[PDB]
Every structure is written in C-alpha cells, then in structure tokens.
Amino acid sequence: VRMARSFHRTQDLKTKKHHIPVVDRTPLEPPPIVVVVMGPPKVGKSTLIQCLIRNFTRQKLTEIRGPVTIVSGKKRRLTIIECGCDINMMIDLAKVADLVLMLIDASFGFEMETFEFLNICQVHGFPKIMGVLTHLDSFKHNKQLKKTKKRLKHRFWTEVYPGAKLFYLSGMVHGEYQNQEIHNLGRFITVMKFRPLTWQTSHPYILADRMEDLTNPEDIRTNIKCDRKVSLYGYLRGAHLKNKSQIHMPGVGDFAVSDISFLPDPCALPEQQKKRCLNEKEKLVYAPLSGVGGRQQQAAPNLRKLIYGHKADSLDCSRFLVEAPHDWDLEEVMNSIRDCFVTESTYFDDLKGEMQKQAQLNRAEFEDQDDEARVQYEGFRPGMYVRIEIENVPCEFVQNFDPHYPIILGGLGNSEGNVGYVQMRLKKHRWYKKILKSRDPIIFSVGWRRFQTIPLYYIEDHNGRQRLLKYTPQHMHCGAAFWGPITPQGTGFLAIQSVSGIMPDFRIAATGVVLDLDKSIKIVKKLKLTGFPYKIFKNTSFIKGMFNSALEVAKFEGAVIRTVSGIRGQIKKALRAPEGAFRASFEDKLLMSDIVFMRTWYPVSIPAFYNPVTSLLKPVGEKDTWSGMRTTGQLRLAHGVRLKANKDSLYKPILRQKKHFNSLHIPKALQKALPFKNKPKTQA
Amino acid sequence: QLIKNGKKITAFVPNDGCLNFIEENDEVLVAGFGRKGHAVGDIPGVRFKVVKVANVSLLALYKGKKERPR
Amino acid sequence: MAAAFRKAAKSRQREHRERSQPGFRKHLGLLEKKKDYKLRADDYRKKQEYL
C-alpha cells in the first residue's frame, strides 16, 4: 500500500514539470531584465520606482524620464520604465516586458485599467506578474481590512495563476514606503525566472536608451521639414540582428537600418567593471535621458577571399566538369583511392537532452573567433549595447520627441514587410457592450504593429464554404479577413475601436489568433432571386418576376428552386409572352399566395485600406488624440442621416385562422357502378 | 501526442465549439474516459478526453469565466 | 460533462421568428409555411386514397 501510494503521487508531480521542449537561445551574458510599473493614474507608480532604485543602489534620482538601468545584485541588472494610463503605451510595453508590477488601490478597489492591461498581456504573451496593492493605511486593522485583502487576492487569482504572490505596502513614513517592505519586494525580483515567449524569442528588438540627431545643421536651416538621420542606443534583446534589415518602430513607421555597430556596454556588472581599471567610478545607475547616465582555389584563405571579395550570357548548368582527368590506370592513381572503400528515462527527458546538445553547439561554435569576425557569421547576438543608424525619419518625430514615451525597434522577419490577405479566428470580448459590424473600420494590434483596416466577418460551414456575416456573433468565434501586412501564423491580436479619448467602459473589442495568409479571399455571399406564380396547372406553374429576358432563363435551366412553404421544384423552359417568364415543375400544387426563390452564391470583395497609427508623430500634449476613418454610426450622427426600417423586414404576429376543406365529391358515374353495400346513401 | 512517452492517441473534445478554443500545436491536459462505458452516439475504442488547454479548464473558457493566455 | 455544456448554452431562450406576407401582396392571403402546407397536403392525399 505504501509503495503504490508513494509511486502514484510522484508521477502526478512529474506531470506538472512536463512541457513542450524548445532550444534555449538565451545569451551567456543576459541583458538587463525589463520591469514595467503600471496602475491607475495616481496610484503611486513613480514613488515605488524611486524606492526600488534607492533600495538597490543607495542613490536618489531627480526627474526620472524614460528607462533607467541599475545594478541589482551580483548577476542581475534591471531596466525600469513607468507606464502611463494612455492605451498606446500600454500596448507597447506589454510586447516588451519581462516582469510587470501591477499597482492596485486597496481603498478604492479595482479599476478598468488594471483589467485592460491583463487582457493585453494575455493576447501578446503572458509575462511574470507580481501584484502590489497600496493605500492600506486608510483601514484600521479590523475585520474590514482582513476581508478586503482576501477579496482582492482571490479575484486577482482568477486573472493570473492561483497562489500568485501579492505584496502589501502598509504606509508611507516621510512620503516614502517602508524599507523592509521594499527590501522584500526587491528580493523576489532578483530570483524571478522567465519562460521563453514565442514572439520575443523569434524577433530581435531594442528598447532605446538614448536618441541623438545626426544631420547637417545647414540642411535644417534650409528646410526644417527635411527628412532626418537619427542614431539610437540600446541593448539588443530576443534574437540576432543582421547589418541590413527592416525594423518597425511603433507609432512612427517601418524603416531599414543603414549602419549598426557594437559599443562598450555602460552599467556593466561589477565583476566585469573590476577587470577594467577605474578610479573608483562605481557605476551603478545609467539613465542618459534622465541625465544621470553618460589547387589555388582550394586554399581556405583564398577560397574565402574569392567568394566574398563571358560569365553572363552562358549556359546555366549545375554540373562540375573535370578540367584535368586522372589516368585511372597507373598504380599510384589507384593507390590514392583504396582507403575510400571498405577493405530508464522519459521521452521528455531524452528530447530535452537533444535540445541541450544543440544549444551547447550554438554557443561554442564561434567562441574562438573575434567579435568582429563573429558579427559576420552569426550577426549581433543579444545582450550587446549597440548603436542603430536610421535614415529618412520624419521631422515631426525629432521635434516632438517625448522621453517618457518609449522607443521600441522591432526587427522584421522574412516577407513581413509585404502586404496580403490575412485570415483570423476572432471572438468578440465578453465585457464589450457593442458588437462589430463588417465593412466598418477597426484598429488591430498585431505583431509589432498598430493599424486600422476594414475587415469582413464570415462563418465556416461543414462543406467548407465561407459565407459572409453581417455582424460578429455575440457568443461565438468568427472568421475575420482583411488586407494588411504579412504576419506569421499563431500570433494573437487585439481589436480597439478608438485609441483616442477616454470612455468609462471596457475598451478592448475582440481577441483572437492569426490563421492563414493568402492572395485571395474566396468569401461568398448568399443571393436569392424571387418570383411569383401567375398560372398554375397542378404540379406545373408559370413563374414571372425572377428574370427579365429569355437569355436569363436559358442560363439557369435545370436549377433547383423552392417555395417559402418548402415545396421543391426545377426550371424547365422559358415562355414567350412575358419576356422573363418560365415553366417550372414542382413536388406538389402551388397556391397563388406562394413565393418562389432560387438560392445563389455571389463572391464578395474587400477594399485594400491600411492606415497605420502614428501617435508618436504628434505634439507632446496631443499624443493621445489620434483619429482615422469613422464607422457607420458616427457618420450618421455627424450628418442628419436617420435610420429607416423596412416594414417588410420587421417581425409581426401572424394570426392564422382555422382551416376547412370541402367534402369529397364522388362522380355520378362512379356512384352508379359502386356495389350496393358501399354506396353513399342520402335520403330525399 | 503525449509528451512523456511520445505515443499518439485519439481523445474527445467535450462539445462542438470547444474545438474553436483549441489550435494545432497547442498543449493540452488529457484524462481517461470510458471505463464505465460508451454512450449512444459515442465512438467505441476512444478512451481519452481533453480537459484543459494552457492549464485552463475547457468549461471555464466555454462559460466565459476565463481567457486563454498566449 | 456534456449536460453542463448544453445547460449553459440553453440559458438564452429566444427562438427564431416567422416572416409574414409582403404588404403589396397582402390581398392574396397569408404566406403559408411548411406547417400550413402539411394540412392541405394530407387532406388531398386522404381523398385520393379513398377514391
């Protein structure tokens, strides 16, 4: 009994350890961890940042703007950035954050911004989240305080995993949090570990520490509106970066990188800082934006030179001709060739071992070569401070630069710069009040990008047909198709109706995943052609109103038709006297009140409209106010257009009446021939 | 395909429309099924069912009480 | 637990509604559906079998 009970328990604990193995591609020297601090507008975000910086570095910084990099421990550094209430920043920081500190006002309770950000993180890859709740000094250490903590913790356990850690900030001593609570909070940040997120692992990305403009001053004097060349500094994260590549900067646009160079890293770990001789500089804080920081061809040396250092209008053949054939009869020629010829673990553990061998080979392959040599073969590895030169930047970016708003540079993969037809699986959000109408504009947040397009909503049938829908279903998933940038399959997306303005309700409209990319939509709509009977001969009836010429009927001969009542029929021939009339046979006799129709499928099309959001190219006070194409409801309000409803389309009570039939009429000839026993008997 | 031993099996999804929550190459939790027997309209010879996807129960996703993390 | 799935879906009890005759054809009578035709269909079949 003990053997069985103990054995089955351990197997159940092993199941928690199982997951899909993937190759570990993290660098040996990791870059600083990205920590974002968010919350409702006046919850205490900036106060906590100053306490954390002082806790680790014993330094107080004034006028913090943008990311700040500090040394926190022997082997870990942190990049700290504050997140504002604006929805655009909330979308960007979720795509980059490794750790999220979410602040909750315990006295007021939960607010909408807390739940909106959690949904954003769920879509784009869920990071490690630690919840901190403040303003507990309002309560008076009674039942009310004890029950409030339990109520907030258990609701928080639904959005994240159950048993997640919460931190309590009891009170402020001199406008600062207590040191012991901050020290414990900082300790858990130091030991946190992180899972490999799909998007972050695939694509290189950079959070910019410093921006500087590199243009000729006389060009600015000539024309202020000229395109400008800009240099950017930051740590490389995620994946390797090539010298010539395409990168998307959210809020500005897509660019190609002209020059890239690795640079000595500021705010290095003290052990590496020990190696370089210093006059006790003790660098622990780096924040430049805040101001605190800052056989001839066979030879390898000739073969490599020949490749990477007449022929045209010639035959293309992948065949290597022999310029000098060997004799193959001499004994020594025969000699040179003779040596060629013959004279108890889980599957999860074994697959993990194979992943480890590949990961070890990746790191140790180019270790001997110099860094300059390494860049050519493998690109810029993550974890190096790098300098990025971008040309043709709009002038409005430089003149309206705000250090608070982060600058993110996301590398593009193959074909991600192109545009096409994108098919998505889509579901309207449960907490959204309205439904989405097809052929209306909406803003999608996919990949690195935020843009506005016009989608088509459709539904799948069992035979495989995709038929158009008027609206998004209230409780079901739905297909969505639109014209936009190419994005790899399996990535989540998020839908917003308006990024500008503030509304009391939940702002996330819908959520889903990318399924397919193509050049054709193949979506179809149902079209019914309607006619009415005017002459009836038992099964056969004459139908008018469906067509307007005899050529029309000839194209549709043999087509299946039916009545509203459900009687099925077939088109036979066209008549002569009405131009569109035709003859049809049916299952049963029709009534004059009946209506016949034919079911047809008509392919549809979508406009190619793609309007990226350009919030960073706005004045510093106006980065919130970005607008685009308006929807059908907004246009009706702007003008004097009023909805008019068809009387026929409305639903009304039917109010049917009891039905009678004539008594059966027996012909007089039949009555005479009937046998005497079974004759209808009537007494006159 | 089970992660522990690499075997390939066939399982039931509890309801049509829970298929929409599940995509290919996803990680799911599988429990046994059918020791009691097979009901009318159930395919014999299938002895497994899908319970969770991304460590979230399928009923909670269907009822709209939780959202699937990516 | 298929019963729990069905019971949750059946929480909303709105059923689909019937469309009526168009107004410009109102003089003809009521638009007949499958239930209405089934009455006149069985009545004719009953008489033909008797004859």
């Binding site: 007021f108 607010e111 909408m112 409780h475 | 009822k63 709209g64 009480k65 | 019971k7 949750a8 929480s11």
Partner: peptide
Amino acid sequence: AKRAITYQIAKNRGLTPRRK
C-alpha cells in the same frame, strides 16, 4: 475621473444557468 469596474467584471458569472 476614476473608471471603476462593473458588477459584471467584479463577479464573472459568465454563462451560468438561470434558476428560479
């Protein structure tokens, strides 16, 4: 200026069967 969560968000009842 504070956006409090609704009763629907606070108690995620979802699709719960309606009972008498």
